[PDB]
Amino acid sequence: SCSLEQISDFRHEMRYQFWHDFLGNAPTIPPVLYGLNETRPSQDKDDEQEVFYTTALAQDQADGYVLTGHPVMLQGGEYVMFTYEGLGTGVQEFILTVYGTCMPMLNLTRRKGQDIERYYPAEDDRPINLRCELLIPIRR
DNA sequence: TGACAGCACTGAATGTCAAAACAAAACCTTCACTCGCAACTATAATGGGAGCTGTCACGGATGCA
DNA sequence: TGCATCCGTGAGTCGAGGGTAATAAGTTGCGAGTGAAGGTTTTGTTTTGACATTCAGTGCTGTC
Numbered sequence A: 001s002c003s004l005e006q007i008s009d010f011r012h013e014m015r016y017q018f019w020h021d022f023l024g025n026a027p028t029i030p031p032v033l034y035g036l037n038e039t040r041p042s043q044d045k046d047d048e049q050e051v052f053y054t055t056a057l058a059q060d061q062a063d064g065y066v067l068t069g070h071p072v073m074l075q076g077g078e079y080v081m082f083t084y085e086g087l088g089t090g091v092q093e094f095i096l097t098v099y100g101t102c103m104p105m106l107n108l109t110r111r112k113g114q115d116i117e118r119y120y121p122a123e124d125d126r127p128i129n130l131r132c133e134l135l136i137p138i139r140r
Numbered sequence B: 001t002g003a004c005a006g007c008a009c010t011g012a013a014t015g016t017c018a019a020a021a022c023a024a025a026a027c028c029t030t031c032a033c034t035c036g037c038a039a040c041t042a043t044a045a046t047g048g049g050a051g052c053t054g055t056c057a058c059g060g061a062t063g064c065a
Numbered sequence C: 001t002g003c004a005t006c007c008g009t010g011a012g013t014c015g016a017g018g019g020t021a022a023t024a025a026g027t028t029g030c031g032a033g034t035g036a037a038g039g040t041t042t043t044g045t046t047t048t049g050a051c052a053t054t055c056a057g058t059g060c061t062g063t064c
Helices: A010-025 A090-099
Strands: A034-037 A054-056 A083-085 A115-118 A131-135
Touching: A010 A054, A083 A090, A090 A131
Parallel strands: none
Antiparallel strands: A034 A054, A034 A115, A083 A131, A115 A131
């Protein structure tokens, strides 16, 4: 529960300690990352909500993945490949320039569901200019 | 020369009179049932101690006799 | 004038481990009190006339 500028300042740790707990027992490095944001309103007065953020490990070439959590089936329907070049501090303004601008300036209405993030940890000191997709479930 | 400072006034955009509705549970009816009282039953029956408690110890006491 | 009897008294501060267990009749009648929660009532968050300003708006007005 944080600010507009803290829409990715808080979100940096929710992928990292989730990754480095599993990397202590991972013989590989899974190179496709998945993050899921959720908007769920209330029932008492319809002015409030809460957000449960789920980063996940990919069902990839390593079959045995003993990770705490849930087997999450990704939502189907229309999506958008918002590929990017920039560091996780640059997805801070990239999430804000897709959601402050690219939903008005491309005039699109994102649909109900989990906003799929597609980071790339395959290029994980210099500041890393990573590549990432923001696969929004869209209703065009 | 062009900035550079300040004025003229629209008006959309505020700050007030009203309701408009929605869940809030809050207090409140309800209405069927679960959960409780009370009475009777007719061959014959008739007297506890329920286990208990066993010698400390000098001392003062009151009332019987 | 003794002789029995009947009450009422008895270290200090600690300590441990911890409350235990008989037996007995039912059907039938039938009012009273959780209770299903049925459903209202309130006690608060939202629409619309206003018009009085206000700054926003755009341009001019005047100026270094």
